[PDB]
Design an enzyme around this catalytic site. Structure first.
Site, PDB file in Angstrom:
ATOM      1  CG  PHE A 198      53.577  14.319  47.005  1.00  0.00           C
ATOM      2  CD1 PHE A 198      54.761  14.947  47.362  1.00  0.00           C
ATOM      3  CD2 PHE A 198      53.505  12.941  47.120  1.00  0.00           C
ATOM      4  CE1 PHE A 198      55.852  14.208  47.806  1.00  0.00           C
ATOM      5  CE2 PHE A 198      54.597  12.207  47.557  1.00  0.00           C
ATOM      6  CZ  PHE A 198      55.757  12.846  47.916  1.00  0.00           C
TER       7      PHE A 198
ATOM      8  CG  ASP B 236      43.669  12.971  47.095  1.00  0.00           C
ATOM      9  OD1 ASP B 236      43.408  11.747  47.068  1.00  0.00           O
ATOM     10  OD2 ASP B 236      44.774  13.436  46.733  1.00  0.00           O
TER      11      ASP B 236
HETATM   12  C1  LIG Z   1      53.702   9.752  52.666  1.00  0.00           C
HETATM   13  C2  LIG Z   1      54.947  10.072  52.884  1.00  0.00           C
HETATM   14  C3  LIG Z   1      55.369  11.475  52.927  1.00  0.00           C
HETATM   15  O1  LIG Z   1      54.561  12.388  52.791  1.00  0.00           O
HETATM   16  N1  LIG Z   1      56.722  11.690  52.942  1.00  0.00           N
HETATM   17  C4  LIG Z   1      57.708  10.670  53.352  1.00  0.00           C
HETATM   18  C5  LIG Z   1      58.988  11.188  52.760  1.00  0.00           C
HETATM   19  C6  LIG Z   1      58.802  12.649  53.099  1.00  0.00           C
HETATM   20  C7  LIG Z   1      57.380  12.963  52.601  1.00  0.00           C
HETATM   21  C8  LIG Z   1      57.288  13.248  51.096  1.00  0.00           C
HETATM   22  C9  LIG Z   1      56.848  14.104  53.368  1.00  0.00           C
HETATM   23  C10 LIG Z   1      56.398  15.005  54.011  1.00  0.00           C
HETATM   24  C11 LIG Z   1      55.854  16.093  54.788  1.00  0.00           C
HETATM   25  C12 LIG Z   1      56.492  16.449  55.972  1.00  0.00           C
HETATM   26  N2  LIG Z   1      56.094  17.455  56.739  1.00  0.00           N
HETATM   27  C13 LIG Z   1      54.991  18.112  56.363  1.00  0.00           C
HETATM   28  C14 LIG Z   1      54.307  17.860  55.196  1.00  0.00           C
HETATM   29  C15 LIG Z   1      54.706  16.810  54.370  1.00  0.00           C
HETATM   30  C16 LIG Z   1      53.924  16.491  53.157  1.00  0.00           C
HETATM   31  N3  LIG Z   1      53.918  15.218  52.640  1.00  0.00           N
HETATM   32  C17 LIG Z   1      52.994  15.126  51.664  1.00  0.00           C
HETATM   33  C18 LIG Z   1      52.303  16.301  51.610  1.00  0.00           C
HETATM   34  C19 LIG Z   1      51.315  16.547  50.573  1.00  0.00           C
HETATM   35  O2  LIG Z   1      50.807  17.654  50.349  1.00  0.00           O
HETATM   36  N4  LIG Z   1      50.995  15.461  49.830  1.00  0.00           N
HETATM   37  C20 LIG Z   1      51.389  14.096  50.144  1.00  0.00           C
HETATM   38  C21 LIG Z   1      52.790  13.976  50.732  1.00  0.00           C
HETATM   39  C22 LIG Z   1      52.800  17.135  52.645  1.00  0.00           C
HETATM   40  N5  LIG Z   1      52.392  18.423  52.636  1.00  0.00           N
HETATM   41  C23 LIG Z   1      53.098  19.651  52.592  1.00  0.00           C
HETATM   42  C24 LIG Z   1      54.478  19.783  52.403  1.00  0.00           C
HETATM   43  C25 LIG Z   1      55.022  21.047  52.297  1.00  0.00           C
HETATM   44  C26 LIG Z   1      54.210  22.158  52.257  1.00  0.00           C
HETATM   45  C27 LIG Z   1      52.843  22.013  52.307  1.00  0.00           C
HETATM   46 CL1  LIG Z   1      51.878  23.440  52.440  1.00  0.00          CL
HETATM   47  C28 LIG Z   1      52.278  20.786  52.644  1.00  0.00           C
HETATM   48  O3  LIG Z   1      50.956  20.432  52.661  1.00  0.00           O
HETATM   49  C29 LIG Z   1      50.123  20.900  51.617  1.00  0.00           C
HETATM   50  C30 LIG Z   1      53.247   8.477  52.069  1.00  0.00           C
HETATM   51  N6  LIG Z   1      52.794   8.618  50.685  1.00  0.00           N
HETATM   52  C31 LIG Z   1      53.900   8.675  49.730  1.00  0.00           C
HETATM   53  C32 LIG Z   1      52.124   7.346  50.514  1.00  0.00           C
END
Ligand SMILES: */C(=C\C(=O)N1CCC[C@]1(C)C#Cc1cnccc1[C@H]1NC2=C(C(=O)NCC2)[C@@H]1Nc1cccc(Cl)c1OC)CN(C)C
Ligand SMILES: [Cl-]
Ligand SMILES: [Cl-]
EC number: 2.7.10.1
Length: 315
Positions: A30, A142
């Protein structure tokens, strides 16, 4: 003749100088996600935020802006909202910080302290967010427990609109796609609908009920379409009564129109959430209690003006 109604969503461009205390949270396919505080100028508020970067290049910026377009156009309590974008050399997306991370990690880390009420409530909330995306004609493509975020143990939201499309069917053109969450018609014919998202919802529910087991563990992705064509499905999780497992199996039917609708999944899981021990059998259930507002994660100097993004609205 007119296609769709005009999308009057606002896209907010946020100044880099409005962000303080940036720290890396995690990285993966991501990209990179950071935490921080967004302090909009001329306003006495500090908003905890997550900032995403595709871990500069022209093709990367186009993909992040398609995700920004989709997220700016969604407004629901069970779907992540785009607060805005920051125009650095690489475009960054800004959203509400979800301090408990993703539900896949959460169920693995707290598997001995998760009761039936929380699991069935997360199923209701994920179905509500997905029903809202269906009302907006958005196919997520997804949906998985790694893409559901935990604001609090009581409130989850769907994230990662990287594969989302605005659709009767959508036809993909290559790229890496998560096979173990996809409906069979999507693997074989690249057909994606709200009903193929229902299949992914079934797999997501199986991930929650098995406390984060990997679907079809040890089986290569190339062998999944054959397994599904032979009628094989993910097994009944030990905590699931036949009522909950039957709902998962209905999500994995060959006929897409025979699968439940997200609005029916809201109803069914909501009835089960009223008597959760009749539908999920968990050893030591309901003694266990997870955190709730009624913020240690914040530094003392910030506490007074901290406002969660859900209470920060704009005309
Ligand atoms: C998931 C773990 C996980 O997502 N983690 C654990 C370590 C920190 C992290 C990476 C995170 C986070 C997080 C926190 N606050 C808000 C959003 C998110 C974020 N995480 C993920 C996002 C994503 O888009 N894809 C997957 C992981 C997500 N989204 C975010 C973040 C910032 C801006 C935007 Cl606009 C947004 O959403 C689109 C376990 N997996 C690793 C299995
Ligand atoms: Cl994957
Ligand atoms: Cl994993």
């Amino acid at each position: 003749a007119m296609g769709e109604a005009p999308n009057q969503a606002l896209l907010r461009i946020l100044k880099e100088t409005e962000f303080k205390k940036i720290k890396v949270l995690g990285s993966g396919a991501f990209g990179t996600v950071y935490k921080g505080l967004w302090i909009p100028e001329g306003e006495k508020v500090k908003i905890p935020v997550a900032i995403k970067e595709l871990r500069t290049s022209p093709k990367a910026n186009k993909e992040i802006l398609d995700e920004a377009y989709v997220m700016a156009s969604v407004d629901n309590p069970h779907v992540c909202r785009l607060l805005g974008i920051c125009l650095t050399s690489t475009v960054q997306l800004i959203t509400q910080l979800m301090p408990f991370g993703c539900l896949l990690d959460y169920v693995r880390e707290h598997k001995d302290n998760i009761g039936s009420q929380y699991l069935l409530n997360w199923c209701v909330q994920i179905a509500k967010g997905m029903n809202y995306l269906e009302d907006r004609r958005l196919v997520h493509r997804d949906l998985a427990a790694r893409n559901v975020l935990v604001k609090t143990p009581q409130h989850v939201k769907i994230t990662d609109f990287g594969l989302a499309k605005l659709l009767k069917e959508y036809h993909a053109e290559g790229g890496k796609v998560p096979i173990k969450w996809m409906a069979l018609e999507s693997i074989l014919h690249r057909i994606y609908t709200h009903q193929s998202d229902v299949w992914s919802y079934g797999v997501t529910v199986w991930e929650l009920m098995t406390f984060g087991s990997k679907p079809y563990d040890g089986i290569p992705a190339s062998e999944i379409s054959s397994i599904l064509e032979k009628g094989e499905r993910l097994p009944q999780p030990p905590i699931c009564t036949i009522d909950v497992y039957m709902i998962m199996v209905k999500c994995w039917m060959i006929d897409a129109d025979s699968r439940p609708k997200f609005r029916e999944l809201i109803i069914e899981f909501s009835k089960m959430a009223r008597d959760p021990q009749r539908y999920l059998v968990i050893q030591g259930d309901e003694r266990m209690h997870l955190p709730s507002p009624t913020r240690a994660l914040m530094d003392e100097e910030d506490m007074d003006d901290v406002v969660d993004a859900d209470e920060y609205l704009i005309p």
